[PDB]
Amino acid sequence: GSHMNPPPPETSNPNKPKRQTNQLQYLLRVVLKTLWKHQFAWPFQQPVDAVKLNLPDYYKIIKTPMDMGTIKKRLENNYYWNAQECIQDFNTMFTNCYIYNKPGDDIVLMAEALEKLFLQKINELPTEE
Ligand SMILES: O=c1cc(Br)ccn1CCO
């Protein structure tokens, strides 16, 4: 896309060691699946396109971007070593939204609905085996 958007977060890197865990499997099959199909998922399914949105300050403010399209690729392409790395990606995505936008803006209400679901699912993250 535009040269004025940063490159997306890394989803491929052979030098980074990879592992499947049961918790990572749950993150894809339960957590990502649940949030991706939610009515309010669409703004979170790809990197913020600051050019298309006319938000030229977005990447001035948000220096650690994350989105569910990136997370989906990371899960499907086994990028992670553990569940904490992926959970941190989700939390980064939510916090970016809460930092950039005014409380009570529609996008914040959308994020909060996804976060409530996320929390419920992560409370049930299975014991690592
Ligand atoms: O902050 C966010 C978060 C998502 Br998810 C989409 C767009 N923006 C910018 C405001 O529209």
DSSP states of 4-57: TSPPPPP---TTS-----HHHHHIIIIIIHHHHTSTT-GGGSS---TTTTT-TT
- Ligand 1 within 6 A of 26 CB? no
The angle at the Cα of 24, spanning 34 to 19, to the nearest 5 degrees, equals: 155
- CATH class of the 22-124 domain in this structure: mainly alpha
CA 100 to CA 5: how far, in whole Å? 16
Resolution in angstroms comes to: 1.1
Q: Please give the structure tokens belonging to residue 82.
A: 């553990």
Structural method: X-ray
> Which secondary-structure segment (H or E) carries 73?
helix 68-76
The answer to whether 79 and 20 have CB atoms below 8 angstroms apart is: no
Domain limits of the chain? 22-124
- Ligand 1 within 6 A of 45 CB? no
Distance 79 CA to ligand 1 centre (A): 25
DSSP classification of residue 123:
H
Backbone angles phi, psi at 126, to 5 degrees: -70, 150
The answer to whether 36 and 67 have CB atoms below 8 angstroms apart is: no
